[PDB]
Structures are given as structure tokens and as C-alpha cells.
């Protein structure tokens, strides 16, 4: 009688993602995903191999496409009618 039916549950967490053959460490407090490369990897073409966020959650980034991670990339995860923003960054290890 009062609910607007906007499916506010919306599990938008991100479990783990992997760029090519490198895993990423996810920090939820600042919504960050850090991926390190062994100080020689080409960081302009990385294929999004696998990612699992939650059930019914959709992300702007697809699977199988290659992206340039020379700069941090904003990723939007949408579940139902809610959305959540993350920053994916790749560092050349020093």
C-alpha cells in the first residue's frame, strides 16, 4: 500500500575480477580495485576475462572485451534499481 516497488534490495557487491591473468584486490571502504603488473606488462590492452559481482547484478564492463587501463576506470554495477560505483586502477610495480 506504501511500497513503491523499486526493488531496493539490489546486491551490488563485487566479489573478484581478473584482468587477463592478474587478480585484483578490492577495497569496499573507498570502492577501489587495485591490480598490479610486474613492471613490464603492457597496460593498454587488457581483456576482461572473468568477473562475478552478485545475483542479478549488471555492470557496464562486459566479458571478453579489451580495455586500456592507463588511467583509473569508473565501473558502475547495477542491481534491480540501485547502482554502485567503483574505481579500477592498475599500477606498474616499482
Q: How far is CA 11 from CA 1, 78, 83, in A?
A: 24, 9, 9
φ/ψ of 19, rounded to 5, equals -90, 120
> Which C-beta is closer to other proteins: that of 17 or that of 79?
79
Residues near other proteins (CB under 8 A): 2-6, 8, 10, 12, 28-30, 44-45, 65-68, 70-74, 78-79, 81-85, 87, 89
- Please state, in angstroms and rounded to a whole number, the distance separating the CA atoms of residues 1 and 29: 36
Cβ 94 to other proteins shortest distance, Å: 15
> Which C-beta is closer to other proteins: that of 7 or that of 25?
7
Cβ 12 to other proteins shortest distance, Å: 5
> Which C-beta is closer to other proteins: that of 44 or that of 49?
44
Which SS3 state, helix, strand or coil, does residue 45 take?
Answer: coil
Amino acid at each position: 500500500d506504501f511500497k513503491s516497488g523499486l526493488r531496493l534490495d539490489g546486491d551490488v557487491w563485487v566479489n573478484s575480477i581478473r584482468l587477463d591473468e592478474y587478480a585484483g584486490t578490492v577495497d569496499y571502504q573507498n570502492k577501489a580495485i587495485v591490480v598490479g603488473v610486474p613492471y613490464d606488462y603492457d597496460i593498454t590492452r587488457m581483456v576482461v576475462t572473468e568477473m562475478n559481482l552478485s545475483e542479478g547484478a549488471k555492470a557496464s564492463i562486459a566479458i571478453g572485451e579489451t580495455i586500456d587501463f592507463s588511467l583509473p576506470v569508473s565501473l558502475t554495477v547495477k542491481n534491480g534499481d540501485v547502482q554502485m560505483s567503483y574505481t579500477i586502477t592498475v599500477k606498474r610495480d616499482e
